Amino acid sequence: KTIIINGVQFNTDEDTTILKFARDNNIDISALCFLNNCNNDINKCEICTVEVEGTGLVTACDTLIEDGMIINTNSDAVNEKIKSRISQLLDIHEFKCGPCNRRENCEFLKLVIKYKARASKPFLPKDKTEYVDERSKSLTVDRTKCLLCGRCVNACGKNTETYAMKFLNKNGKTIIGAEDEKCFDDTNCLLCGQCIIACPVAALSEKSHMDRVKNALNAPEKHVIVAMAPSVRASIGELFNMGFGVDVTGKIYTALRQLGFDKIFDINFGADMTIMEEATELVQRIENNGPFPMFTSDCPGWVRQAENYYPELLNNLSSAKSPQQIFGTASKTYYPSISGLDPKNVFTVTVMPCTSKKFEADRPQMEKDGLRDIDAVITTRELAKMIKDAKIPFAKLEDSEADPAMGEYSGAGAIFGATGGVMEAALRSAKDFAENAELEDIEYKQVRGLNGIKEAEVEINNNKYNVAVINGASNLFKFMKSGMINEKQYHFIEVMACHGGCVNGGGQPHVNPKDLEKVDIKKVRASVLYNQDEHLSKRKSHENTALVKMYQNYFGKPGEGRAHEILHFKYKKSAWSHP
Ligand code: 402
Ligand code: SF4
Ligand code: SF4
Ligand code: SF4
Ligand code: SF4
Ligand code: FES
Ligand SMILES: [Mg+2]
Ligand SMILES: [Mg+2]
């Protein structure tokens, strides 16, 4: 097939779209609603408009190339069509970039600038109350910014297959939202925030916890603890023009101190706690010959998936709390016992690449004696803004260290952020626990990587066991519906709602679509974590010295006693009822 684009002749064999073909040959074509290899098929944005001689204006993003095509991507007719579309989008868009949360990295703004489009009449609604939905504990919607591009709808379908994000007909007009315009929390929604990640504007955002955090630091009698997730140190640098795959761990500790936090800890410590409890439980089940399989319980998106679609699996979940909640429980119990602080005055803040983490934190029973495990959860994005609002020169900061007591971590805890991380981490301890040995070879590369469903046979104390890593919520549905769960007897299964693991969470920095093709964001972010694991001296959660002292002096033996009493959490299926 022979193609000519802007006068340049091409003789290729590729079967693909005009748009794909163009980008592969450094030919510029704008796009808006095209993402994840799909566009808005019932309301095409037409930003990708090109002209095919002998046919007219077409959409490049979903039109295949064809021998004999003469294509003009930059004619006046093309640009005025594109300009017209952007102008009409402006007609329903509160174009006030000043206090906007996507103002530094908005796709729509870049399009408005590129084509110099203006609205026929600006959209300045008086009362945004009717446009804003902040009911949810994890997500919020601002429909003054919504372009109706359907990227959230498509991403939810592709990433989770729940189709929790829908087009709705509100009073005769089209919006996006949850089923019957309910609060997402009350629907089958996983609160994974993959919809936010797909959004080209500030229409979708996390539920802000920043006021919680600010009030706590300004409150005289509050002792504010902060602890970031594995993934944060591997990605927050992106929002400070530092590039991708940059370890900024030390800079973060410094930034957090300058922000005024009273204690600097780390969720990787909690991750090591989770392994202590979860490896112990697995070994218990190995020698009780069940119940099998045990599922991980550290992903609140997956927890909600189970609660909403597979409640019969709830009893198979590990009782161990997530690194966030298990750290939190210790922060109100253990940490006062070694600091002299009144438990009531402790305010525990986590930094997460996750929106679902907010819902997990505000679960009614995630507390004891009136004290929440976790009082506030801010996303990676929220922390970035916080650092910028404080005008802290992040890229120029010098490295500091976390406070040891609940800040030290092993290599096992560090790789939690990647898909298969919990699996590898857990196996390192469980094998040592069951074999009563200090084992040399601890790398389980078979459970790593971006394959959606990953399996492996492991041999623990002279017995072969089957494990599986489920990489993404859509892949959970696949694994269960396809009957893969019954093809063999699995013993330990990891499930992460976000493909790639937490490094690809809904609270992570947005990445521009062109950069997404440019850089494998899931593997590059996770590489930071694995590199830490490789160069840490302690690579097993039970070799965490600060953790070992904690169990020795306070909790005792994991899996039983006081440790099982307050560090665990069990999910309950609803009893049978009609109707
Ligand atoms: N809690 C917890 Fe986890 C840990 O440690 C984070 O903390 Fe994750 C990350 N990064 C997130 O958010 S959650 C599911 N387990 C994998 S990693
Ligand atoms: S969504 Fe983008 S274009 Fe709209 S106000 Fe925010 S930054 Fe500006
Ligand atoms: S939070 Fe996740 S499950 Fe809910 S609508 Fe968004 S993408 Fe779908
Ligand atoms: S919420 Fe964002 S991604 Fe979804 S339709 Fe509106 S602008 Fe597009
Ligand atoms: S994979 Fe990580 S970021 Fe995504 S929903 Fe689960 S815990 Fe949250
Ligand atoms: S990007 Fe092609 S129609 Fe939207
Ligand atoms: Mg399509
Ligand atoms: Mg304070």
Q: Are 307 and 571 in contact (CB under 8 A)?
A: yes
Rounded distance between C-alpha atoms, residue 153 and residue 166, angstroms: 6
Q: Are 525 and 503 in contact (CB under 8 A)?
A: yes
Alpha-carbon torsion 144, 148, 149, 153, what sign? positive
203 in ligand 4 pocket by Cβ < 6 Å? yes
Tokens of 340: 């002299």
Phi/psi-derived region of residue 435, left when phi > 0, alpha when psi is between -120 and 50, beta in every other case: alpha
Query: What is the number of alpha carbons within 13 Å of residue 98 lying toward its C-beta?
Result: 2
Q: How far is CA 524 from CA 180, 251, 252, in A?
A: 39, 19, 19
Ligand with minimal distance to 320 CA: 1
How many angstroms is it from 361 CA to the middle of ligand 3? Answer: 18
Cβ-Cβ contacts under 8 Å for 224 (sequence gap 6 or more): 213, 216, 217, 260, 261, 262, 263, 347, 348, 349
Q: Which residues of 184-219 are buried (b: 16+ CB within 10 A; e: fewer)?
A: bbebbbbbbbbbbbbbbbbbbbbbbbbeebeebeee
Instruction: Strand 70-72: give its sheet, edge to edge.
Output: 8-11, 2-5, 70-72, 49-52, 56-59
139 in ligand 4 pocket by Cβ < 6 Å? no
Rounded distance between C-alpha atoms, residue 152 and residue 33, angstroms: 10
Tokens of 112: 């408005």
Pick from 103, 106, 41, 52: which is nearest to 75 by CA? 52
Domain ranges in the chain are 1-123, 124-207, 208-579
Question: What is the rounded (10 degree) CA torsion for 374, 256, 531, 436?
Answer: -40
- Resolution of the structure in the document, Å: 2.0
31 in ligand 4 pocket by Cβ < 6 Å? no
32 in ligand 4 pocket by Cβ < 6 Å? no
DSSP string, 332-354: TTHHHHTT---GGGEEEEEEES-
Cβ-Cβ contacts under 8 Å for 110 (sequence gap 6 or more): none
350 in ligand 3 pocket by Cβ < 6 Å? no
Binding residues for [2Fe-2S] cluster: 33, 45, 48, 61
192 in ligand 5 pocket by Cβ < 6 Å? yes
Nearest CA to ligand 1 atom 7: 229
Judged on CB neighbours under 10 Å (0-12, 13-18, 19+), 524 is middle
Cβ-Cβ contacts under 8 Å for 55 (sequence gap 6 or more): none
How many angstroms is it from 29 CA to the middle of ligand 1? Answer: 38
Q: Are 45 and 147 in contact (CB under 8 A)?
A: yes
Rounded distance between C-alpha atoms, residue 562 and residue 566, angstroms: 6
Q: Which residue has the tokens 């703004």?
A: 109
Binding residues: 33, 45, 48, 61, 93, 97, 100, 106, 146, 149, 152, 156, 189, 192, 195, 199, 299, 354, 498, 502
Residue 214 is given by DSSP the state: H
DSSP H stretches of helix in 440-560: 473-481, 484-487, 513-518, 521-535, 545-550
How many angstroms is it from 79 CA to the middle of ligand 7? Answer: 22
Question: Which numbered atom of ligand 2 lies nearest the CA of 109?
Answer: 3
Ligand with minimal distance to 47 CA: 6
194 in ligand 3 pocket by Cβ < 6 Å? yes
Tokens of 400: 């500091």
Nearest CA to ligand 1 atom 2: 323
Q: How far is CA 557 from CA 92, 385, 531, 567, in A?
A: 60, 41, 31, 12
Nearest CA to ligand 3 atom 2: 192
Question: Which numbered atom of ligand 3 lies nearest the CA of 196?
Answer: 6
Ligand with minimal distance to 202 CA: 2
Nearest CA to ligand 4 atom 2: 199
For the chain, report the end-to-end CA distance as a whole number of angstroms. Answer: 62
Rounded distance between C-alpha atoms, residue 95 and residue 380, angstroms: 25
Tokens of 554: 């306070």
Alpha-carbon torsion 185, 189, 194, 195, what sign? negative
Judged on CB neighbours under 10 Å (0-12, 13-18, 19+), 393 is exposed
Question: Which numbered atom of ligand 1 lies nearest the CA of 323?
Answer: 1
Bridge-based pairing of strands 204-206 and 139-142 is: antiparallel
Cβ-Cβ contacts under 8 Å for 231 (sequence gap 6 or more): 353, 380, 417, 501, 502, 503, 505, 508, 525, 529
Q: Which residue has the tokens 């989008």?
A: 89
For 455, other C-beta atoms within 10 Å of its C-beta total: 18
- Please tell me whether the peptide bond between 293 and the residue prior to it is cis, using omega within 30 degrees of 0: yes
Pick from 352, 303, 314, 269: which is nearest to 496 by CA? 303
Amino acid at 392: I
Is 551 strand, coil or helix?
A: helix
Rounded distance between C-alpha atoms, residue 41 and residue 505, angstroms: 26
Pick from 337, 327, 348: which is nearest to 226 by CA? 348
Pick from 341, 402, 404, 333: which is nearest to 371 by CA? 333
Is 399 strand, coil or helix?
A: coil
Go through the chain and tell me how many residues it has: 579
Question: What is the rounded (10 degree) CA torsion for 124, 126, 127, 132?
Answer: 0
Amino acid at 286: I
Cβ-Cβ contacts under 8 Å for 206 (sequence gap 6 or more): 138, 139, 140, 193, 196, 355, 358, 379, 381, 382, 506, 507
Rounded distance between C-alpha atoms, residue 262 and residue 221, angstroms: 11
Rounded distance between C-alpha atoms, residue 374 and residue 363, angstroms: 10
Q: Are 5 and 22 in contact (CB under 8 A)?
A: yes
> CB within 6 Å of ligand 1 — which residues?
229-231, 267-268, 271, 298-299, 322-324, 352-354, 357, 416-417, 422, 502, 505
Phi/psi-derived region of residue 536, left when phi > 0, alpha when psi is between -120 and 50, beta in every other case: beta
Domains 1-123 and 124-207 fall in the same CATH topology: no
Tokens of 55: 């046919």
Tokens of 187: 């629907």
Q: What CATH architecture applies to the domain 1-123?
A: Roll (3.10)
Q: Are 387 and 394 in contact (CB under 8 A)?
A: yes
How many angstroms is it from 173 CA to the middle of ligand 4? Answer: 15
Strand intervals (E) in 328-477: 346-352, 367-368, 371-372, 376-379, 453-459, 464-471
For 545, other C-beta atoms within 10 Å of its C-beta total: 11
- Domain at 124-207, CATH from 1.20.1730.10, 3.30.450.40, 3.30.70.20, 3.50.50.60: 3.30.70.20
Rounded distance between C-alpha atoms, residue 111 and residue 95, angstroms: 13
Pick from 404, 402, 414, 406: which is nearest to 257 by CA? 402
Amino acid at 239: L
> Contacts for 306-311 with beta carbons within 8 Å, 24 or more apart?
306/571, 307/571, 308/188, 308/190, 309/188, 309/477, 310/480, 311/573, 311/574
Q: Which residues pair with 489 in a beta bridge?
A: none
When computed from its CA atoms, the radius of gyration of the chain, rounded to whole angstroms, is 25
Rounded distance between C-alpha atoms, residue 155 and residue 178, angstroms: 14
Rounded distance between C-alpha atoms, residue 490 and residue 109, angstroms: 49
Cβ-Cβ contacts under 8 Å for 538 (sequence gap 6 or more): 410, 411, 544, 545
DSSP string, 131-148: TEE--SSSEEEETTS---
How many angstroms is it from 145 CA to the middle of ligand 3? Answer: 18
Tokens of 499: 């493909």
Amino acid at 39: N
